[PDB]
């Protein structure tokens, strides 16, 4: 019936506070959702778990017997990353073979060299029911496994007690 | 003169670009906030740290002495997960008890069997000031701890030096 | 006729559902972006990796020889956190020095005390070609390294095989 005042329409039309722009609505429609933010956080967690499993998995290398020794059991060094070092756990049993039963029976790779300034000394069992058949084994700074004393040169010697850490070297 | 033109009111009411809908406002009010996204990221970080602490925690089991041996100190196998295997660290001291002082003194759980194709060999101390009282221990592929030779059957034998990686 | 009806203007002006407020618009402009949420997730991943790498790094402490023994090679305990415990890996070689060749040659720090109710028993190599020159070592509950028996008191004794877990703390 009655007509609207131009002033009232004008004030409404010029009230920018109660209207929007087309570009505003595109901006707001594109904002992140709670489900999208949670998916990204879930993926960060999954990536973290995968990185941890990778970092903490056990690695292995096979060692070749030297100086006439034989690998009566396969000579295997297993190792685990801890920070920028490795924990190295040797395994296997060496036999006299054609050598003397003494001396260097195997050498580990250079990246498994021990953190040490001279030989490290290990007590090892020999494969024997006589408890006097044990060994004094040196692990050298270049990672030679050097059998220095044995109860008997004719009895096999175990390497399963040789465990050590490497130097602080980025990897 | 002072009245508003119908053409002007009509163009305004049909400018959908500058107006919204109830559905728009519900959608926009429900969008993620900066603190809400940060809370979710913070929770992911806390969950990662908790998962790491759990995955690297030590588990323990007290072992049953076998073949007449006694647990002069409790025989405990402690173990840590690494990837798809465990690092196992045995502890305790066995006494002769009603047995001979040699043979299988304990067997670890099957899932802690060593990664090996034959026995693993360990030198062990006995509980003695005589250094000839030591022991040769074989850890079998079925995780038997077999004291195969000792300096003296009448002296206790330690298990604290047995450490190894399992299979799988 | 050509003029706008006051009822139609009034109805539009009173339709709050199709209009907004200044506060609405600040609320929506402040909302998180896909890029911003992804940056926060990326930082959570980077922080997790940094925490893991630090947490699993090896720590070291040098031990002082006691009771007249000497350190022919430095006595160093290296240790790794595993949950609420530590794995301790001892290293070094002790000599008789001015002592007797037996007894407590070194004590580890209190926070590296072993999880044990009595001594833990270790066989150690001596620096000798005679395999009868080995040692029985007791690690006490107070973390004393006690050389209880040796084949020869005049030959050095290695500590490189002593590995153990601490208590839950």
Residue B37 gets the label, from left (phi > 0), alpha (psi -120 to 50) or beta, of: alpha
Q: Which of residues 25-44 of A touch C (CB under 8 A)?
A: 27-28, 30-32, 36-37, 40-41, 43-44
Asked whether the beta carbons of B56 and A82 are under 8 A apart, the reply is no
Tokens at B97, concatenated: 């008890």
For chain A, the straight-line distance linking the first and the last C-alpha, in angstroms and rounded, comes to 85
Q: CB of B102 within 8 A of CB of B145? A: no
- H/E run at residue C13: helix C6-13
Q: State the DSSP H helix or E strand holding residue A78, giving kind and residue range, or none if neither.
A: strand A70-82
Q: Is B8 in contact with C4 (Cβ distance < 8 A)?
A: yes
Q: Show which subunits contact B, needing at least 3 CB pairs below 8 angstroms.
A: A, C
Other CB atoms within 10 A of residue C11 CB: 11
Tell me how far apart the alpha carbons of residues C36 and B41 are, in angstroms, rounded to a whole number. Answer: 11
Question: Under a CB-based contact definition with an 8 Å cutoff, are residues B93 and B63 in contact?
Answer: no
Query: Would strands C59-62 and C70-82 be described as parallel, antiparallel, or unpaired?
Result: antiparallel
- DSSP single-letter state for residue C88: E
Residue in B163, C84, C148 with CA at minimum distance from that of residue A78 = B163
Please provide the DSSP assignment of chain B as one string.
--BPBHHHHHHHHT-GGG---HHHHHHHHTSPPHHHHHHHHHHHHHHHHHHHHHHTPPEEEEPPP-TT-EEEEEEEEEEEEETTEEEEEEEEEEE-TTS-S-EEEEE--GGG-BS-SS-EEEEEEBSSS-TT-EEEEEE-TT-EEEEEEES-TTS-EE-TT-EEEBP-
Nearest partner of C167 among C50, C96, C89, C87, judged by Cα: C87
A32 contacts B28? CB cut-off 8 A: no
Cα distance between residue A16 and residue C20, in whole Å: 10
- Partner A, chain B 94-113, Cβ-Cβ below 8 Å: 102
Q: Which two tokens stand for residue B28?
A: 């926009």
Residues near C154 by beta carbon (within 8 Å), at least 6 away in sequence: C96, C101
Q: Which of C27, C84, C136 has its CB closest to that of B126? A: C136
Extended beta strands in chain C, E state: 59-62, 70-82, 85-95, 103-107, 120-125, 134-139, 144-150, 157-158, 163-165
Contact B88, B166 (CB under 8 A): yes
- What values do phi and psi take at C49, rounded to 5? -60, -45
Q: What is the resolution of this structure in A?
A: 1.7
Beta bridge partners of B124: B135
Residue C146 to residue C140: CA distance in whole angstroms? 7
């Amino acid at each position: 019936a009655q007509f609207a005042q131009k002033t009232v329409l004008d004030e409404h039309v010029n009230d920018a506070d109660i209207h929007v722009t087309a570009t505003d609505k595109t901006n707001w429609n594109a904002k992140e959702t709670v489900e999208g933010a949670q998916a990204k956080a879930d993926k960060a967690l999954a990536d973290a778990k995968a990185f941890f499993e990778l970092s903490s998995s056990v690695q292995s290398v096979t060692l070749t017997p030297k100086n006439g020794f034989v690998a009566s059991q396969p000579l295997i060094a297993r190792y685990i990353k801890f920070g920028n070092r490795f924990l190295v756990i040797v395994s296997g049993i060496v036999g006299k073979g054609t050598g003397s039963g003494t001396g260097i029976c195997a050498t580990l790779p250079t990246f498994l060299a021990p953190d040490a300034s001279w030989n490290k000394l290990y007590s090892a069992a020999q494969q024997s029911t006589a408890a006097s058949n044990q060994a004094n084994i040196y692990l050298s700074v270049s990672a030679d496994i050097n059998i220095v004393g044995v109860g008997s040169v004719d009895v096999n010697t175990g390497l399963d007690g040789i465990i050590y850490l490497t130097k602080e070297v980025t990897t």
